[PDB]
Design an enzyme around this catalytic site. Structure first.
Site, PDB file in Angstrom:
ATOM      1  NE  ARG A 134      -0.539   0.000   4.950  1.00 23.66           N
ATOM      2  CZ  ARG A 134      -0.153  -1.186   5.393  1.00 23.66           C
ATOM      3  NH1 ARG A 134      -0.493  -2.285   4.725  1.00 23.66           N
ATOM      4  NH2 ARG A 134       0.543  -1.273   6.514  1.00 23.66           N
ATOM      5  CG  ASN A 135       2.670   2.726   2.921  1.00 24.36           C
ATOM      6  OD1 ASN A 135       1.807   3.576   2.719  1.00 24.36           O
ATOM      7  ND2 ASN A 135       2.747   2.026   4.048  1.00 24.36           N
ATOM      8  CG  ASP A 148       3.831   6.024   4.301  1.00 24.06           C
ATOM      9  OD1 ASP A 148       3.732   4.993   4.999  1.00 24.06           O
ATOM     10  OD2 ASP A 148       3.398   7.138   4.662  1.00 24.06           O
TER      11      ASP A 148
HETATM   12  C1  LIG Z   1      -0.504   9.712   0.685  1.00 22.48           C
HETATM   13  O1  LIG Z   1       0.638  10.091  -0.106  1.00 22.48           O
HETATM   14  C2  LIG Z   1       0.584   9.578  -1.449  1.00 22.48           C
HETATM   15  C3  LIG Z   1       1.805  10.153  -2.199  1.00 22.48           C
HETATM   16  O2  LIG Z   1       2.766  10.614  -1.571  1.00 22.48           O
HETATM   17  N1  LIG Z   1       1.751  10.105  -3.543  1.00 22.48           N
HETATM   18  C4  LIG Z   1       2.806  10.618  -4.419  1.00 22.48           C
HETATM   19  C5  LIG Z   1       2.451  10.204  -5.719  1.00 22.48           C
HETATM   20  N2  LIG Z   1       2.928  10.179  -6.975  1.00 22.48           N
HETATM   21  N3  LIG Z   1       2.091   9.665  -7.731  1.00 22.48           N
HETATM   22  C6  LIG Z   1       0.998   9.306  -7.039  1.00 22.48           C
HETATM   23  N4  LIG Z   1      -0.028   8.705  -7.722  1.00 22.48           N
HETATM   24  C7  LIG Z   1      -1.222   8.414  -7.133  1.00 22.48           C
HETATM   25  O3  LIG Z   1      -1.490   8.670  -5.963  1.00 22.48           O
HETATM   26  C8  LIG Z   1      -2.212   7.759  -7.892  1.00 22.48           C
HETATM   27  C9  LIG Z   1      -3.363   7.340  -7.229  1.00 22.48           C
HETATM   28  C10 LIG Z   1      -4.391   6.683  -7.909  1.00 22.48           C
HETATM   29  C11 LIG Z   1      -4.285   6.425  -9.274  1.00 22.48           C
HETATM   30  N5  LIG Z   1      -5.274   5.798  -9.937  1.00 22.48           N
HETATM   31  C12 LIG Z   1      -6.366   5.413  -9.020  1.00 22.48           C
HETATM   32  C13 LIG Z   1      -7.475   4.658  -9.745  1.00 22.48           C
HETATM   33  N6  LIG Z   1      -6.924   3.457 -10.390  1.00 22.48           N
HETATM   34  C14 LIG Z   1      -7.989   2.686 -11.048  1.00 22.48           C
HETATM   35  C15 LIG Z   1      -5.897   3.872 -11.363  1.00 22.48           C
HETATM   36  C16 LIG Z   1      -4.771   4.602 -10.635  1.00 22.48           C
HETATM   37  C17 LIG Z   1      -3.142   6.850  -9.949  1.00 22.48           C
HETATM   38  C18 LIG Z   1      -2.118   7.513  -9.260  1.00 22.48           C
HETATM   39  C19 LIG Z   1       1.231   9.646  -5.749  1.00 22.48           C
HETATM   40  C20 LIG Z   1       0.696   9.644  -4.427  1.00 22.48           C
HETATM   41  C21 LIG Z   1       0.640   8.168  -1.455  1.00 22.48           C
HETATM   42  C22 LIG Z   1      -0.475   7.412  -1.818  1.00 22.48           C
HETATM   43  C23 LIG Z   1      -0.423   6.019  -1.840  1.00 22.48           C
HETATM   44  C24 LIG Z   1       0.747   5.356  -1.486  1.00 22.48           C
HETATM   45  C25 LIG Z   1       1.868   6.101  -1.122  1.00 22.48           C
HETATM   46  C26 LIG Z   1       1.817   7.501  -1.107  1.00 22.48           C
END
Ligand SMILES: CO[C@@H](C(=O)N1Cc2[nH]nc(NC(=O)c3ccc(N4CCN(C)CC4)cc3)c2C1)c1ccccc1
Length: 273
Positions: A134-135, A148
């Site tokens: 998850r991170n 994270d």
């Molecule tokens: C809370 O901080 C963020 C963080 O720092 N970050 C930095 C960083 N860089 N790029 C990121 N991309 C996304 O969060 C993301 C989320 C969902 C996404 N879609 C969602 C729906 N899906 C069907 C397709 C993909 C596509 C990209 C993040 C978050 C974090 C979030 C999760 C894990 C680690 C860190």
């Protein structure tokens, strides 16, 4: 000093999560996609130290498998942390949405990337404490990057955490190795929940009793052997991340080594005469 970005260069485009929001956006410095984390008016002293501390940590790092810090907005409000955009989001969700879609060699390459990032962090004397799929974030080249970062803000997640960290709060790069073992199991199972429906207390009891997660289906024997060594009760017996990176690199460079699978224990019998 991290790079200070002027707010006119940053366009928030859509909310992609919470952590007070994480946006997908664009950064002008042609424009590039970025992730944008914000900190709203009324934040406390501790929140500010944690927020900018996360940026300060990430600014010290320069590695392919560690999320890159593009810069911060600190002179204006709301403050922002700007990082590279990872198009495929968190690894746990990504695997669960793409069940069975990758080759074993692709899955192991993902683990090699995570391990290289973790070897870098450990050598940099950074203990992650919350290493889990998850991170870990995934980009459009299938590259996995540890994310994270912070201090007290990142956290305990029992079924990812080493026994000594649960029992007496000893968090080291060797408890991160235990977590990496769980991440190996997460990847090879396409994001199954570790220990399935066992409660947190049942997990700790099982671990103390000597039980360990069983082999994933279609899992190379060498890969199951490596994750089992990550889960040694005695901290000092676990591989270091340098050993893990070395093994994964050797397996990938001789990819026929991954065709030898560990036996899978069926939890179901199907008899057809
Ligand atoms: C809370 O901080 C963020 C963080 O720092 N970050 C930095 C960083 N860089 N790029 C990121 N991309 C996304 O969060 C993301 C989320 C969902 C996404 N879609 C969602 C729906 N899906 C069907 C397709 C993909 C596509 C990209 C993040 C978050 C974090 C979030 C999760 C894990 C680690 C860190």
């Amino acid at each position: 000093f991290t790079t200070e970005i002027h707010p006119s260069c940053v366009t928030r485009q859509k909310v992609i999560g919470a952590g007070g929001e994480v946006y997908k956006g664009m950064l002008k410095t042609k424009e590039v996609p970025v992730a944008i984390k914000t900190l709203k008016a009324g934040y406390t002293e501790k929140q500010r130290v944690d927020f900018l501390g996360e940026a300060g940590i990430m600014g010290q790092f320069s590695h392919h498998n560690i999320i890159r810090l593009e810069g911060v907005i600190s002179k204006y409000k709301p403050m922002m942390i700007i990082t590279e955009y990872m198009e495929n989001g968190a690894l746990d969700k990504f695997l669960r949405e793409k069940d069975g879609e990758f080759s074993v060699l692709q899955l192991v390459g993902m683990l090699r990337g995570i391990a290289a990032g973790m070897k870098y962090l450990a050598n940099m004397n950074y203990v992650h404490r919350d290493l889990a799929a998850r991170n870990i974030l995934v980009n459009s080249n299938l590259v996995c990057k540890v994310s994270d970062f912070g201090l007290s803000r990142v956290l305990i997640p029992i079924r990812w955490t080493a026994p000594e960290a649960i029992s007496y709060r000893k968090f080291t790069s060797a408890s991160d190795v235990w977590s990496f073992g769980i991440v190996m199991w997460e990847v090879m199972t396409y994001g199954e929940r570790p220990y399935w429906e066992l409660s947190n207390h049942e997990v700790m009891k099982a671990i103390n009793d000597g039980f360990r997660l069983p082999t994933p289906m279609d899992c190379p024997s060498a890969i199951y052997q490596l994750m089992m060594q990550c889960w040694q009760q005695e901290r000092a017996r676990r591989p270091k991340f340098a050993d893990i990176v070395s093994i994964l690199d050797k397996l990938i460079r001789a990819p026929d080594s991954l065709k030898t699978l560990a036996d899978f224990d069926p939890r179901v019998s199907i008899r057809l005469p």
